[PDB]
């Protein structure tokens, strides 16, 4: 089905992205780790310690359930309930002294846009990231692509009170049309809400635009410089020649198109390959 193909494609993107930035022995902090479904990806890269934090105790309880049911992994796994975006990370990790900070990489998958609810939250998130990371370390992940959002919004007339687009498996519905009223520009980079539906995945949940230019300029303020901004389509097209034979048999077959090449085709292509982008930054200097 389209949704199964989308999940496999996005899982492949995460495999490639994690492998790109993680090295053997690294300590990884995963913000908004949800139910902790990427442990095997980090294990393949040879990490020494995974620290996952999520605001939901139901999610962490599930992540712990899932972790405890695995095997004799070669790495330590720490799973913590805490708010990675709205509060100092020190709050969440005070009672987990086994964490080894500063860490080598910070990851955040399909979640960092929640930090753009307000400027205060965006900045608190970035301060948490840089305080956690070694100089030279990387911050990477996957977000909705503001540039694709802007393209779709630029095709919506101002008469539409709640700008919306979608297909048989996903939909985006903006809370307001202030973008269109303001000359096709958001009135603020923060708090620009839209509800997101994805079949059997996200149940019409409010989230916020993450305008990439603002993310990048704020990250620079906190000492992080851009490493990667490729949309999922371009990232996959560039990385697939080196990855076809590295994927598991099941993931490779899942990516196989009707023409014998790899990727997504059919209705999942827009939400899987255009709606999201990769990001990465490197911490190049200390922040006072
Ligand atoms: C958390 N989240 C997940 N997605 C999309 O949903 C897909 C699945 O999201 P996922 O891999 O985080 O969870 P899943 O339900 O697959 O696994 P489980 O938690 O282990 O049961 C992703 O590949 C994205 O397409 C998301 N899409 C958007 N726009 N916003 C989100 O907050 C978001
Ligand atoms: N602030 C937050 N911290 C951690 N996980 C989250 N998921 C959604 N918002 C979150």
Numbering used by the authors: 138 to 425
What is the paper's account of this structure, in its own sentences?
The antibiotic sinefungin (SFG) is a SAM analog in which the S-CH3 sulfonium moiety of SAM is replaced by a C-NH2 amine.
Here we co-crystallized KlAbd1Δ137 with 0.9 mM m7GTP and determined the structure using KlAbd1Δ137-SAH as a search model. The final model was refined at 1.33 Å resolution with Rwork/Rfree of 18.5/20.3. Electron densities for m7GTP were observed in both methyl acceptor sites. Additional electron densities were observed in the methyl donor sites, which were interpreted as the co-purified adenine moiety of the product SAH. The tertiary structure of m7GTP-bound KlAbd1Δ137 was virtually identical to that of SAH-bound KlAbd1Δ137 (r.m.s.d. of 0.4 Å over 287 Cα positions). The guanine moiety of m7GTP is buried in a deep pocket created by Phe247, Ala248, His250, Phe333, Ile339, and Phe412. The guanine-N1 and -N2 atoms make a bidentate hydrogen bond with the Glu344-Oε1 and Oε2. Guanine-O6 makes direct and water-mediated hydrogen bonds with Tyr251-OH. Guanine-N3 makes a hydrogen bond to Tyr413-OH. The ribose O2′ makes hydrogen bonds with Asn147-Nδ2 and Tyr413-OH.
